[PDB]
From Swiss-Prot:
Belongs to the mitochondrion-specific ribosomal protein mL42 family. The chain holds residues 46 to 142 of 142 of the full protein. Its main location: mitochondrion. Keywords: Mitochondrion, Ribonucleoprotein, Ribosomal protein, Transit peptide. It comes from Homo sapiens. It comes from the Eukaryota. The gene is MRPL42. GO terms for biological process: mitochondrial translation; translation. The keyword Mitochondrion applies. It is found in: Mitochondrion. This is Large ribosomal subunit protein mL42.
Length: 71
RNA sequence: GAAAUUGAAAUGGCGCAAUAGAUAUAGUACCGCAAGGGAAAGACAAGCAUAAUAUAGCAAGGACUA
């Protein structure tokens, strides 16, 4: 849904792209132990087990607790 | 590798500071049958602990919110 148009001199391309709204008809009304724990978490979040095991103090201390923040 | 020949006057350290300077705290201890050999030392390194560990690998780098 974009309108392309060179200008008369042909030196600049003009693109008209209005934002199209979602039609009302295209919408639905609003409705009104360590082992087993890690298996449950992996099933819940569609991950593997390895993510949920802890890490040693060395890794934990290596993690930066005051990371730079942008925007 | 010569000699002939020639004819110099007169308390200190750009030395060390205990692995250095004597081997030297001592020619002792100790070693050797013996001759001999011959030391060491006195005034937050490594290793650990606080705090073991998490898939993958020269152990880092690029990074990354992490
Ligand atoms: Mg000495
Ligand atoms: Mg140390």
């Amino acid at each position: 849904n974009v309108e392309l148009a060179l200008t008369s001199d042909g030196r600049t391309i003009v693109c008209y792209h209005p934002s199209v709204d979602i039609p009302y008809e295209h919408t639905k009304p609003i409705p009104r132990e360590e082992g087993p724990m890690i298996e449950q978490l992996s099933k819940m979040f569609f991950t593997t087990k390895h993510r949920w095991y802890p890490h040693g103090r060395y890794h934990r201390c290596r993690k930066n607790l005051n990371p730079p923040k942008d925007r």
